[PDB]
Scaffold this active site. Structure first.
Site, PDB file in Angstrom:
ATOM      1  N   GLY A 133       0.805  -1.206   0.000  1.00  0.00           N
ATOM      2  CA  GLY A 133       0.000   0.000   0.000  1.00  0.00           C
ATOM      3  C   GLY A 133       0.839   1.258   0.000  1.00  0.00           C
ATOM      4  N   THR A 134       0.264   2.328   0.537  1.00  0.00           N
ATOM      5  CA  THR A 134       0.930   3.621   0.614  1.00  0.00           C
ATOM      6  C   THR A 134       1.481   3.836   2.018  1.00  0.00           C
ATOM      7  OG1 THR A 134      -0.529   4.544  -1.082  1.00  0.00           O
ATOM      8  CG2 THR A 134       0.680   6.094   0.296  1.00  0.00           C
TER       9      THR A 134
END
Lengths: 204, 250, 233, 243, 245, 243, 108, 245, 242
Positions: free
Chosen positions: H30-31
């Site tokens: 993810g981020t």
């Protein structure tokens, strides 16, 4: 008053010497109008009788509920049951539903098959526990029999002397009440056999 | 949302018996050795308590519990499988004739109702059976004492003198050799010590061997001086020193 | 042995995703090609829907909700006759109970976890239906792109379908010009017409198979069909 | 196999994509909605020379002004008797009028397709989505005669002329040029029987097929065996006059 | 998981029948041999036992053979614990009949009702039935004596002489040619004792491995009498029938 | 078929494969502890590892307060450790609601074991292989320690520990308990009893620690507390002055 | 025995087409199976071979092969080429009581 | 097969099933979103990767602040992260219903761990494949707890996720020696953009957007604010001030 | 309970539940029936060889719905009786509502209606039960014959029969028996029925049972003596060479 008192009739039971006397009447009806001259309150399974007093909805219909668990006791244990043991199922069944309880106080009278000690039982409509060594009765006219056997019954009486005591007290108690009458049948409880004797009383 | 698995247990293998029951006897052979006998003068329930650590006190462990004062019981194999049964038995017995009548039903049909639940665990979906076998004695009314063996299936076994656990085949023949019309209470203790103790090895003490007697009623166990309509809790268990005292008699 | 990481809903792939979503992403290209954007004050939805026969007509994916909002779904619609109708019930439920304009956030927030409950709770399949929902409120028009993975976002415009990436990328340069021009909804609908020509490399522009929706401040939600799109063809 | 929730590589269910094979195993039927009435018909064929075609119903009636047919297993045909027929009466219970064919089909499709693995509120217990191809036709109080169909996949589409069954591949191919806007009721009666002649494997018989029609006045009316035999004789006289 | 390990043994198997019914026959084969016989003066019911030892105590003695009513008995072939659920269950339905018509129930009513209990497990619920076969014996005022035998599949057929357990076809063959329309209590017992000797691998026949409870017509009176014979009385049967071992 | 890697069935060895993997590695946390009993009190000591500079030492604990008189010792996976902790704390309050006395050791240890034994019946729900040790001081019987095994095994323990070194400390304690012939420690002054248990812990490890590197607590009569950073450091310094 | 599960990994559509299953013989088939076996066999002329054919349970040519041998060895002990009637029923029982077992499925 | 990928109801030799191990790779993909715990309050950070110019900045916010007094942020899968938000905010509303008081951070952490541990017990329930980072201000002080996808959570003075989780926390320890208790948390907001800028070197593809939602012990005293205007561009320019190229 | 479905839809339309539900009749005994003018005749057989029981004490295929409607079939045993009791309650349900006896047409729909939920809805498996339904209508003497498939498919028939090798036995009635010209005398339906019963069970006439359904609540069950009367007439002109 009591919805179960619309029919009427009572079951008298006493305790003698090595004998038990229990009796009821043949009267069944609605209020002052009678219906059944052949009706019998005393029911018998095992060695111990069962008296029932109240509305036929709770007398004859619930009789299938008594023999429901009684026959299961008979088909499993395959033996007898003490009067104190079967009496607990009676009381417990009334206190299962406090709002809807059954209005028929039973009468339980029999002779012990093990120790051979006569014992009587049975409760009122609420299930209040009353157990004595003299007499245990129920119904609306049971108030009479409370003082009748006090001036009549004697400790350690023969079955023939006990037969005359319970018979004479029941015949006059039914004449005084509108809910009891129309013949009286008396059963003599012995160790094994039971003798049935029909009696004649005032008709009207 | 819980219990989404409705499917039953393992189905029939090309055997004719159930594989769940066949593997259940494996824990019995690997479990504790228990026995029982009815001498009509008493019922002695003896077993062994396995202690795998020196820091483990056996005072907390009791393999013989009391469901009713006249009925003793002993198990084999998995320990906690019997503990949950005691919690369930006492609740089912509460809904049994204890509440209905003034007395609990005799050992014959009381265990059959409890053992019926064990068979329901072998049928209904999502529940799993146990690995344990129970030896349950007791005192009936007309028949006096009693002894019954319970498989994980739950079929009642009206024996006289039997033994289960590790080395049950060798310990069962010894019970068949010593018999007569009527035995005694103390004789059943000495016979069990010459069988249970001599069959296993490594535990010579009484803390690791649990023994209890049935048919002996002490007046201090009633708790009241009132009219004794019944004798009392015939079940009695020897203390730590009383078990070792039985060993010095042989 | 891909039956383990795919056929099972509760299983996890070695990449950290569910392979059931990968097939749901492909269902977007297998369905009809739609084009939509948000110009703020006006909003245009142009959805081209092919039929199964020359004598047959398509079925309407677009379901009318209220005057200030609308929705156009792409790909297929196996469960949308239930979900979107249940969502349409929630459109009026928010208005008749909470008195809400039903922006693009909560409308895609509940549907995000709703499709997840099928994977979380055993006994159901994932929905896997793309939803493009637009709505108007005091803050203007907003677009909601709903992926089968529970994507909650806002775009000036998007085009999803079969070979629809050409209309998606080519309009990014003129995107700032389309949003700044308001008051002329005709030119805004014609902007989506050019997106249809870029999305069809095989057949030509249809007439009855073309569906155009519009929503705005004064102009309510409506679906252009038949002679309504005659000026936009 | 594995869970039903498994999709196709395109993201579709297997039971939905495979529902077209059970339609070919059924009876071939071609509905047509003309300017005058709506032509309905099916094919009984024969399972035996002793088979009786009187008690078998392959064409049902949901309401007087509409009609229905079936191609497939007869089990799912009765599922709409408690659903489509109930919804048609439910409409008369509330709005007390004739339901629009356009709205009725979408309303039936809501009660038609419901399934899955399981759900508490809705009943997903149904495994196969459809085993039968149900035809939906009638008359609208606003637009007019509308010929729709309930697909085994569950969707719905507007069909000017629809052909279902195993012979739907070769019948619908020529049906494009056969169907016209000027096609009337009488011209469409001999057209269906002519197409079914190339379909039906046996000789055309009153017991091998059943036809009906939807009238905006009298309503749904079945063709009796005496009347069906008349259309058979008119077909033999028409085919001989074509050349 | 919850699918690949679930083969749905309750539905149609590729053999065209139910595995749970076919494999239960082996469990019946391992079950004790119970041979019912309906005579003119009563119904003869015999059964075997599992692993009879020297210290095995016989008091109630009823394991695979029970008694539902004074006029109605029951016998089971299979796992005892599986039957115990339906032993008292039929009595509950029987006691409900007493609550209903207040009289004695014919056996034919409770035969099919209990058949759907095990069949209901295969029908729905995802459960599994019992592999225990049932044998019903009762009385009637119309058909007289009644002797029935059930199976885990739900089949029920009337049998005057029935045999289950091991050597099913072997025991029924000897009883078929030796059958007679007129048989009394003593005549039916002597034919059953000779058959049970060839069923098992043990030496002859003894009283310890024989579970026998029968019914007759009256004892002091002329109707409604049944008693389960104690194992001490079973030993005296071998002396009366003239067959020692 | 036959493998326990999904469902749970009896293995041919008479031992469940789930019970194996639960008993095999409880040390995946890689932590040790010890539990001993004094005269009127109970002393428990657990090792603590802080592999970061950002960790709050007051937050990380393997000893949770259940009742006022009751401590707890838990070793295993962190997420599954609080599953039995939150349940035991909820079940501890149920004792007062049903009774209104303080939770005895014979109950809380039995309830969590019986709840874990139900997991043997349920094939769908996963059991817990987390080490559960309930330590407290009873009023009548004094100190008591009951270690609840994941298979349902619980019994009286005069002393217990965790990790592979549990048997090493047991050897040193068995010799001291054999000569004195007492299960607990008859010596008073629990402040010096904590240092007595550390000596047996150093023999298994061989290194020292800081105030926040050791989780130590003392169960006293009608009280249970947790030593702070200053109370732990005081005992580690004072033990060097004696021996 | 049963090639069902075995079959469609091999047979293929049309390389090998055959299906033959064991069939219960009727009154006519049982006479030709048992009657021809007795062509070279000799036995009592007062015993009919079709007596046990009327009522019998699934006895094929394999079952008859033993009933001829089992009854033959008993008569050969007395050194006689003819077999009595008692050996006919005695040989049928032990064959029917061993390999022949049904599923106890009635009615249906 | 191995059973750990299909079923989470079994036991792994390492204590963590392979199914739980797959949740770690989903979060790391993810981020990156970090967190700050200092003496002046608790500061979060969130980044939104821009795939195309069609995305609109200052719209999607992964930080979910429960009321004004508790912040929370997730990563990885969107639906699994927002599923806990509806349950976390529902228990907070039920908390103020019974006790009529604001919920502290430690009382908020146990409600999150109970859902993860319960979903791993049932084989039919899909567990959480996302990591949870939550914090805020309570009646005591600043507290920051991160919920791992396995369910393990404890005291954290810093948080990180996505790419370079343990690499981003290296800059947090550098502030520990500089500030023992963290002192001023306003400068940490500028340090937050620099820590996120450290991951921009290898992860640089398209334009980046940074959002900050924080809470303070002093300024807010339990309230909630947001970084915008001059404070928005001041922290961004600080991360690019060190390395201009 | 069980949330899933016990059946799975087939890619080609070949369903495991439909497979062995038809062969359940192929494994069981045959049920023979033929219609008529004022009555209908339903024959049957028995698989058991040795018979220690009586026809009256043990019912097999004998079941009744309405007063004049006798319903006899063989698809199974246990699963067959479940649909019968539900039909009898449904037959009473029309007496509790419609007050009139239900036609045979719906009696077939109700049996297939319960089988409809089996094939459609999950949680319960379908049966192998295939019912041949007969009987009359109120104030109507015309019989009916409906072959009910376990998949819920029914059709009108005349000489149709289901059982072991019943497709070949029915071919004998496809020519000699004319559906357009049904017989008049009740015994004429028995003459063609007995000849069809000897192609399966052959000997062992004790297993052969014939149930004749007659109006005005009358049921005649033929004995073994009346069946042998038509057996002699079979070999009279058949053995003679013309």
């Amino acid at each position: 008053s009591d919805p179960s008192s619309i029919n009427g009739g009572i079951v008298v039971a006493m305790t003698g010497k090595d004998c038990v006397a229990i009796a009821c009447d043949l009267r069944l009806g609605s209020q002052s109008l009678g219906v059944s001259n052949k009706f019998e309150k005393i029911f018998h399974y095992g060695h111990v009788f069962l008296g029932i007093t109240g509305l036929a909805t709770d007398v004859t219909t619930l009789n299938e509920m008594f023999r429901y668990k009684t026959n299961l006791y008979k088909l499993k244990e395959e033996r007898a049951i003490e009067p104190e043991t079967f009496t607990q199922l009676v009381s417990s069944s009334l206190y299962e539903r406090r709002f809807g309880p059954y209005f028929v106080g039973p009468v339980v009278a029999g002779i012990n098959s093990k120790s051979g000690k006569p014992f009587i039982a049975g409760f009122d409509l609420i299930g209040c526990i009353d157990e004595a060594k003299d007499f245990i009765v129920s119904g609306t006219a049971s108030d009479q029999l409370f003082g009748m056997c006090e001036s009549l019954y004697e400790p350690n009486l023969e079955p023939e002397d006990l037969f005359e005591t319970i018979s004479q007290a029941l015949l006059n108690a039914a004449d005084r009440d509108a809910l009891s009458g129309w013949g009286a049948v008396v059963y003599i409880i012995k160790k094994d056999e039971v003798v049935k004797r029909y009696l004649k009383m005032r008709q009207d | 949302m819980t219990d989404r698995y409705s499917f039953s247990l393992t189905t029939f293998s090309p055997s004719g018996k159930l594989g769940q029951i066949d593997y259940a006897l494996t824990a019995v052979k690997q479990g504790v050795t228990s026995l029982g006998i009815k001498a009509t003068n008493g019922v002695v329930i003896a077993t062994e308590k396995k202690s795998s650590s020196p820091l483990a006190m056996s005072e907390t462990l009791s393999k013989v519990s009391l469901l009713t004062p006249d009925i003793g019981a002993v198990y084999s194999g998995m320990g906690p499988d019997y503990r949950v049964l005691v919690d369930k038995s006492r609740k089912v017995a509460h809904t049994s004739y204890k509440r209905i009548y003034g007395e609990y039903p005799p050992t014959k049909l009381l265990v059959s109702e409890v053992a019926k639940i064990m068979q329901e665990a072998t049928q209904s979906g999502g529940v799993r059976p146990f690995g344990v076998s129970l030896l349950i004695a007791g005192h009936d009314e007309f028949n006096g004492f009693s002894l019954y063996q319970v498989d994980p299936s739950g079929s009642y076994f009206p024996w006289k003198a039997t033994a289960i656990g590790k080395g049950s085949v060798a310990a069962k023949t010894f019970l068949e050799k010593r018999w007569n019309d009527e035995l005694e209470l103390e004789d059943a203790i000495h016979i069990a010590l010459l069988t249970l103790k001599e069959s296993v090895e490594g535990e010579f003490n009484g803390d690791t061997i649990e023994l209890a007697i049935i048919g002996d009623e002490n007046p201090d166990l009633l708790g009241y001086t009132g009219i004794p309509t019944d004798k009392g809790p015939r079940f009695r268990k020897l203390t730590s020193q009383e078990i070792n005292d039985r060993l010095e008699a042989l | 042995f891909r039956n383990n990481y795919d056929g099972d809903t509760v299983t996890f792939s070695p990449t950290g995703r569910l392979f059931q979503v990968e097939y749901a992403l492909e269902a977007i290209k297998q369905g009809s090609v739609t084009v939509g954007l948000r110009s703020n004050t006006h909003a245009v939805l142009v959805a081209l829907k092919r039929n199964a026969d020359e004598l047959s007509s398509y079925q309407k994916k677009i379901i009318k909700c209220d005057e200030h909002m609308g929705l156009s779904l792409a790909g297929l619609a196996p469960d949308a006759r239930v979900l979107s109708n249940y969502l349409r019930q929630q459109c009026n439920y928010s208005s008749l109970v909470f008195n809400r304009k039903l922006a693009v956030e909560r409308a895609g927030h509940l549907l995000c976890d709703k499709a997840q409950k099928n994977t979380q709770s055993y006994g159901g399949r994932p929905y896997g239906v793309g939803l493009l929902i637009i709505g108007y409120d005091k803050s203007g028009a907003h677009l909601l792109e709903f992926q089968p993975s529970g994507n909650v976002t806002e775009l000036y415009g998007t085009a999803i379908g079969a070979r629809s990436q050409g209309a998606k990328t080519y309009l990014e340069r003129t995107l700032d010009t389309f949003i700044k021009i308001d008051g002329n909804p005709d030119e805004l609908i014609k902007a989506g017409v050019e997106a249809i020509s870029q999305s069809l490399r095989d057949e030509s522009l249809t007439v009855d198979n073309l569906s155009i929706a519009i929503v705005g401040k004064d102009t309510p939600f409506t679906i252009y069909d038949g002679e309504a799109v005659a000026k936009y063809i | 196999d594995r869970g039903v929730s498994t999709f196709s590589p395109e993201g579709r269910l297997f039971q939905v994509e495979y529902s077209l094979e059970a339609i070919k195993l059924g009876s071939t039927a071609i509905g047509i909605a003309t300017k005058e009435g709506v032509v309905l018909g099916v094919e009984k064929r024969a399972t035996s020379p002793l088979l009786e075609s009187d008690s078998i119903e392959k064409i049902v009636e949901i309401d007087r002004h509409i009609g229905c047919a079936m191609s497939g297993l007869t089990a799912d045909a009765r599922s709409m008797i408690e659903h489509a027929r109930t919804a048609a009466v439910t409409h008369n219970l509330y709005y007390d009028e004739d339901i629009n064919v356009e709205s009725l089909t979408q309303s039936v499709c809501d009660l038609a397709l419901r399934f899955g693995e399981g759900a508490s509120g809705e009943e997903r217990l149904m495994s196969r989505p459809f085993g039968v191809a149900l035809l939906i036709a009638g008359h609208d109080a606003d637009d007019g005669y509308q010929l729709f169909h309930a697909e085994p996949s569950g969707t719905f589409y507007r069909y000017n002329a629809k052909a279902i069954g195993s012979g739907s591949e070769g019948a619908q191919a020529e049906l494009l040029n056969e169907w016209h806007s000027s096609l009337t009721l009488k011209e469409a009666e001999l057209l269906v029987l002519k197409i079914l002649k190339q379909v039906m494997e046996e000789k055309l018989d009153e017991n091998n097929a059943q036809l009906s029609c939807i009238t905006k006045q009298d309503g749904f009316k079945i063709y009796d065996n005496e009347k069906t035999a008349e259309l058979i004789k008119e077909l033999k006289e028409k085919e001989a006059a074509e050349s | 998981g919850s699918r690949r390990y679930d083969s749905r043994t309750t539905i149609f198997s590729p053999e065209g029948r139910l595995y749970q019914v076919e494999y239960a026959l082996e469990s019946i084969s391992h079950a004790g041999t119970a041979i019912g016989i309906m005579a003119s003066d009563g119904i003869v019911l015999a059964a075997e036992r599992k692993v009879t030892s020297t210290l095995l105590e016989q008091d109630t003695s009823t394991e695979k053979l029970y008694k539902l009513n004074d006029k109605i008995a029951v016998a089971v072939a299979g796992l005892t614990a599986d039957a115990e659920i339906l032993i008292n269950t039929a009595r509950i339905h029987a006691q409900n009949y007493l609550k209903t018509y207040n009289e004695d129930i014919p056996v034919e009513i409770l035969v099919r009702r209990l058949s759907d209990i095990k069949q209901g497990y295969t029908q729905h619920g995802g459960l599994r039935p019992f592999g225990v076969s049932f044998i019903y014996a009762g009385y009637d005022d119309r058909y007289g004596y009644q002797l029935y035998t059930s199976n885990p599949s739900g089949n029920y057929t009337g049998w005057k002489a029935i045999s289950v357990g091991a050597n099913t076809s072997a025991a029924q063959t000897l009883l078929q040619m030796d059958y007679k329309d007129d048989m009394k209590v003593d005549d039916a017992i002597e034919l059953a004792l000779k058959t049970l000797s060839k069923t098992t691998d043990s030496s002859a026949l003894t009283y310890d491995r024989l579970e026998f409870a029968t019914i007759r017509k009256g004892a002091n009176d002329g109707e409604v009498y049944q008693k389960i014979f104690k194992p001490q009385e079973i030993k005296d049967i071998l002396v009366k029938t003239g067959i020692t071992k | 078929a036959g493998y326990d890697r999904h469902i749970t069935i009896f293995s041919p060895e008479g031992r469940l494969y789930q019970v194996e993997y639960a008993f095999k590695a409880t040390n995946q946390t890689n932590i040790n502890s010890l539990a001993v009993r004094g005269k009127d009190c109970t002393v428990v000591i657990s090792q603590k590892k802080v592999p970061d500079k950002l960790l709050d030492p007051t937050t990380v604990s393997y000893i949770f307060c259940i009742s006022r008189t009751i401590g707890m010792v838990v070793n295993g996976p962190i997420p599954d450790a609080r599953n039995a902790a939150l349940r035991a704390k909820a079940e501890a309050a149920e004792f007062r609601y049903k009774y209104g006395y303080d939770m005895p050791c014979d109950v809380l240890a039995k309830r969590m074991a019986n709840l874990s034994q139900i997991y043997t019946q349920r094939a769908y729900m996963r059991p817990l292989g987390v080490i559960l040790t309930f330590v407290s001081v009873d009023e009548e019987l004094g100190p008591s320690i009951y270690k609840t095994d994941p298979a349902g095994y619980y019994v009286g323990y005069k002393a217990t520990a965790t990790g592979p070194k549990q048997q090493e400390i047991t050897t040193n304690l068995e010799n001291h308990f054999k000569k004195s012939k007492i299960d607990h420690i008859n010596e008073e002054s629990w402040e010096k009893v904590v240092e007595f248990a550390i000596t047996h812990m150093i023999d298994a490890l061989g290194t020292e620690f800081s105030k926040n590197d050791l989780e130590v607590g003392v169960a006293t009569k009608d009280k249970f507390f947790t030593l702070s950073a200053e109370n732990i450091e005081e005992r580690l310094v004072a033990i060097a002055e004696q021996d | 025995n049963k090639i069902e599960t075995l079959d469609p990994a091999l047979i293929r559509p049309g390389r090998i087409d055959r299906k033959i299953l064991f069939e219960n013989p009727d009154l006519s088939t049982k006479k030709k199976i048992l009657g021809i076996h007795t062509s070279k066999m000799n036995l009592s002329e007062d015993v009919n071979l079709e007596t046990l054919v009327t009522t019998k349970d699934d006895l094929s040519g394999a079952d008859i092969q033993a009933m001829c041998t089992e009854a033959g060895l008993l008569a050969l002990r007395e050194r006689r080429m003819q077999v009595t009637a008692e050996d006919f029923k005695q040989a049928k029982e032990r064959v029917m009581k061993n390999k022949v077992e049904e599923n106890l499925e009635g009615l249906y | 097969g191995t059973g750990y990928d299909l079923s989470n109801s079994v036991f792994s030799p390492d204590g963590r099933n392979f199914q739980v191990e797959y949740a770690v790779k989903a979060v790391e993909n993810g981020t990156t979103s970090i967190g700050i715990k200092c003496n002046d309050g608790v500061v979060f950070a969130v980044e939104k990767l821009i795939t195309s110019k069609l995305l609109v900045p200052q719209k999607n916010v992964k930080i979910q602040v429960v009321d004004r007094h508790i912040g929370c942020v997730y990563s990885g899968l969107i639906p699994d992260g927002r599923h806990l938000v509806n349950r976390g905010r529902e228990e907070a509303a039920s908390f103020k219903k019974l006790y009529k008081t604001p919920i502290p951070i430690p009382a908020f952490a146990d409600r999150l761990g109970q859902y993860v541990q319960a979903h791993t017990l049932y084989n039919s329930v899909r567990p959480f494949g996302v990591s949870t980072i939550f914090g805020g201000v309570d009646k005591n002080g600043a507290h920051l707890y991160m919920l791992e996808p396995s369910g393990s959570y404890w005291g954290y003075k810093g948080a990180a996720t996505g790419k370079g989780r343990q690499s981003a926390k290296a800059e947090l320890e550098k502030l520990v020696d500089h500030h023992p208790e963290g002192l001023s948390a306003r400068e940490a907001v500028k340090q937050a953009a620099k820590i996120i800028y450290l991951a921009h070197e290898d992860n640089k593809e398209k334009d980046f957007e940074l959002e900050i939602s924080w809470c303070s012990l002093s300024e807010t005293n339990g309230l909630h604010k947001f970084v915008k205007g001059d404070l928005l561009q001041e922290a961004i320019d600080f991360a690019q001030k060190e390395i201009n190229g | 309970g069980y949330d899933r479905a016990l059946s799975i839809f087939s890619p080609d339309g070949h369903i495991f539940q439909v497979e062995y539900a038809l062969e359940a009749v192929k494994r069981g005994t045959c049920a023979v029936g033929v219609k008529g003018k004022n009555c209908v005749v339903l024959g049957c057989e028995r698989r058991s060889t040795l018979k220690l029981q009586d026809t009256r004490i043990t019912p097999s295929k004998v079941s009744k719905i309405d007063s004049h409607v006798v319903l006899s079939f063989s698809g199974l045993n246990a699963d067959s009786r479940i649909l019968i009791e539900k039909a009898r309650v449904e037959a009473q349900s029309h007496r509790l509502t419609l007050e009139d006896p239900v036609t045979v047409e719906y009696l077939t729909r109700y049996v297939a209606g319960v089988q409809q939920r089996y094939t459609q809805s999950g949680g319960v498996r379908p049966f192998g039960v295939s019912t041949l339904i007969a009987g009359f209508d109120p104030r109507d003497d015309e019989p009916k014959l409906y072959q009910t498939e376990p998949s819920g498919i029914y059709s009108s028939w005349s000489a149709q029969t289901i059982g072991r090798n019943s497709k070949t036995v029915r071919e004998f009635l496809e020519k000699n028996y004319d559906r357009k010209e049904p017989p008049a005398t009740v015994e004429e339906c028995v003459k063609l029925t007995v000849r069809s019963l000897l192609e399966v069970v052959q000997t062992g006439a004790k297993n052969i049972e014939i149930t004749v359904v007659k109006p005005d609540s009358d049921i005649v069950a033929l004995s073994s003596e009346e069946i042998n009367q038509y057996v002699t007439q079979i070999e009279q002109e058949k053995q003679e060479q013309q």
